[PDB]
């Protein structure tokens, strides 16, 4: 996990187009017609982790190995969803514990463009200021979504600094990043916020919520994976 066969090249509003297939765990969650409504991350061949607010159902599909959603010829994997595991602690009011697991009916075929992201340990500490990356097909301007996968490097923010803006809206299962010239936007939800852990890309956050106008000077809020990973491991072990 966490090691792309195709290395990404770095240097979402104000992000940049990603190297095709360089974020192999990034999936597109689409309805039965092919309409992209959220992103997600493969954690292994049979499971995808995304946001609870995305409201995924077994009627939706997981699209892996995609880069250009405007390309009909591009080879991808349209995977059916067997069951949806929404964290029962998801708070629809505060948006806390915003995570859901998707169990595929048929396993994804890992390859150069399709593989898993690593999961952190509940005790992992990703220091504020750490430069991480988020990816997705969300709006690049606050408008239709970009066809090609976008990426952006952004710093993790301390809870104290995040709260300077969002105040008490920041809960224990949330982690902030951004306010640095880039911003996740509509369509990016459920997607990954990854940071390197001993050289391997690890899922630190899941795009959740933020500026209602996708302002690049405001902290973006993500589901804090370290606070939810035990729930993840438990769900996998039981299913």
């Amino acid at each position: 996990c966490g090691v792309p066969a195709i290395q990404p090249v770095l240097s979402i509003v104000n992000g940049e187009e990603a190297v095709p297939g360089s974020w192999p765990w990034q999936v597109s969650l689409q309805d039965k017609t092919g309409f992209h409504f959220c992103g997600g991350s493969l954690i292994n061949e049979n499971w995808v982790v995304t946001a609870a607010h995305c409201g995924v159902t077994t009627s939706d599909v997981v699209v892996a190995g995609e880069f250009d959603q405007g390309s009909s010829s591009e080879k991808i994997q349209k995977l059916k969803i067997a069951k949806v595991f929404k964290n029962s602690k998801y708070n629809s009011l505060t948006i806390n514990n915003d995570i859901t697991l998707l169990k595929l009916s048929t396993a994804a075929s890992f390859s150069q463009t399709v593989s898993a992201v690593c999961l952190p340990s509940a005790s992992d500490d990703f220091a504020a200021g750490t430069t991480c990356v988020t990816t997705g097909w969300g709006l690049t301007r606050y408008a239709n979504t970009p066809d090609r996968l976008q990426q952006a490097s952004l710093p993790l923010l301390s809870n104290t600094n995040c709260k300077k803006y969002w105040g008490t809206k920041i809960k224990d299962a949330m982690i902030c990043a951004g306010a640095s010239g880039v911003s996740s936007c509509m369509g990016d939800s459920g997607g990954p916020l990854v940071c390197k852990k001993n050289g391997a890309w690890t899922l630190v956050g899941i795009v959740s919520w933020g500026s209602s106008t996708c302002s690049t000077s405001t902290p973006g809020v993500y589901a804090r994976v370290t606070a939810l990973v035990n729930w993840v491991q438990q769900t996998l072990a039981a299913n």
Binding site: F37, H53, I95, G138, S184, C185, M186, D188, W209
Partner: protein
Amino acid sequence: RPDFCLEPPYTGPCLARIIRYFYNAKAGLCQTFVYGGCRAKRNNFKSAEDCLRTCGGA
């Protein structure tokens, strides 16, 4: 009809791209809009039929 039927569509702070319907009193029809996934207001429906049955004529 409920006054919430007269409110403009509300995307919310979440970052999903979910298609929902809202009643547009200016046109007298329910139209689609992008919902972010959380904190939906009441003029937000999963189908045009639900929207018309709740807000039609407002």
